[PDB]
Design an enzyme around this catalytic site. Structure first.
Site, PDB file in Angstrom:
ATOM      1  N   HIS A  79       0.764  -1.124  -0.049  1.00 13.12           N
ATOM      2  CA  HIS A  79       0.013   0.028   0.133  1.00 13.12           C
ATOM      3  C   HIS A  79       0.884   1.208  -0.168  1.00 13.12           C
ATOM      4  O   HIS A  79       0.390   2.228  -0.301  1.00 13.12           O
ATOM      5  CB  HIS A  79      -1.202   0.051   1.073  1.00 13.12           C
ATOM      6  CG  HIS A  79      -0.419   0.161   2.339  1.00 13.12           C
ATOM      7  ND1 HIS A  79      -0.663   1.033   3.117  1.00 13.12           N
ATOM      8  CD2 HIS A  79       0.052  -1.028   3.405  1.00 13.12           C
ATOM      9  CE1 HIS A  79       0.052   0.879   4.251  1.00 13.12           C
ATOM     10  NE2 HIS A  79       0.303  -0.434   4.588  1.00 13.12           N
ATOM     11  N   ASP A  99       0.134  -7.903   1.537  1.00 17.38           N
ATOM     12  CA  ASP A  99       0.690  -6.593   1.689  1.00 17.38           C
ATOM     13  C   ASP A  99       2.190  -6.414   1.681  1.00 17.38           C
ATOM     14  O   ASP A  99       2.637  -6.055   2.655  1.00 17.38           O
ATOM     15  CB  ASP A  99      -0.452  -5.667   2.402  1.00 17.38           C
ATOM     16  CG  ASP A  99      -0.512  -4.198   2.016  1.00 17.38           C
ATOM     17  OD1 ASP A  99       0.465  -3.841   1.395  1.00 17.38           O
ATOM     18  OD2 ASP A  99      -1.107  -3.457   2.562  1.00 17.38           O
ATOM     19  N   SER A 145       3.312   1.505   8.934  1.00 23.68           N
ATOM     20  CA  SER A 145       3.397   0.641   7.714  1.00 23.68           C
ATOM     21  C   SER A 145       5.043   0.437   7.364  1.00 23.68           C
ATOM     22  O   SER A 145       5.760   1.118   6.813  1.00 23.68           O
ATOM     23  CB  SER A 145       2.875   1.313   6.489  1.00 23.68           C
ATOM     24  OG  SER A 145       1.507   1.741   6.931  1.00 23.68           O
TER      25      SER A 145
END
Length: 238
Positions: free
Chosen positions: A68, A117, A192
């Site tokens: 992402h 991801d 992240s």
């Protein structure tokens, strides 16, 4: 009740302003520790104009982050800058990049399906023609299969939204481990691409973000879980 237990546990981490969290749940990594593993592999991933996150360096000019994050570059790698070991100076006015930065050579956007991801970035060398491998040591991959509920570990990364300058250690507590990893812990969106490091220093997972838990009104953190299949498949690039 499961919900109340969750709410109560989650409030250990989100019930108070993050600055009033105890050091053993959330603490700034110090410049001494950053010289060492596991810390030295971890670094701030930037995507100029788009996002700020984390990445762990896994060897030979190569770094993993979330899909992402990486996708935002839109197959234009020179938007992506990595900065390992980055930390505030003693006063906390300035910033130190102990081994400078890197610009991306190309993006391997989600190599294992959009199912997982994760993305691999390969950076070029710095202005001196040095490569990340030269200056810092690679994080040391391992399977997550040994982790289980109630166990603890260390999420390590750059909680931009809380503190733009430093790497933090977020202590996490697992809720489940079989399909992916799900845990209590203080994280913000910049985490992240943070790295889940177990009591032996092994890079066993990669923080993604938060996800619905029990119902739509609650959430918990989750990460890519690392198995030998992916360890092998990753090590086929480096």
């Amino acid at each position: 009740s499961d919900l109340k237990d969750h709410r109560d546990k989650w409030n250990k981490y989100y019930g108070v302003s993050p600055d009033q969290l105890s050091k053993d749940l959330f603490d700034k990594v110090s410049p001494e520790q950053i010289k060492n593993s596991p810390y030295q592999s971890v670094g701030r991933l930037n995507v100029q104009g788009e996002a700020v996150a984390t990445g762990v360096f896994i060897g030979k000019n190569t770094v993993v982050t979330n899909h992402h994050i990486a996708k935002e570059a839109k197959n234009n790698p020179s938007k992506i800058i990595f900065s390992p070991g980055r930390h505030a100076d003693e006063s906390n006015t300035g910033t130190v990049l102990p081994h400078g930065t890197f610009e991306a050579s190309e993006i391997i956007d989600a190599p294992f399906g959009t199912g997982v991801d994760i993305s691999v970035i390969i950076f070029k060398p710095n202005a001196e023609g040095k490569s990340i491998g030269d200056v810092i040591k690679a994080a040391d991959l391992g399977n997550s299969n040994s982790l289980k509920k109630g166990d603890t570990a260390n999420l390590i990364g750059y909680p931009y939204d809380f503190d733009s300058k430093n790497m933090y250690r977020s202590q996490v507590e697992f809720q489940s481990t079989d399909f992916g990893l799900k845990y209590y812990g203080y994280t913000v969106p910049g985490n992240s691409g943070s790295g889940i490091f177990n009591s032996e220093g092994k890079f066993v997972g990669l923080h993604i973000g938060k996800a619905k838990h029990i119902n739509s009104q609650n959430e918990i953190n989750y990460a890519v879980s690392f198995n030998d299949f992916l360890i092998r498949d990753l090590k086929q690039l480096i």
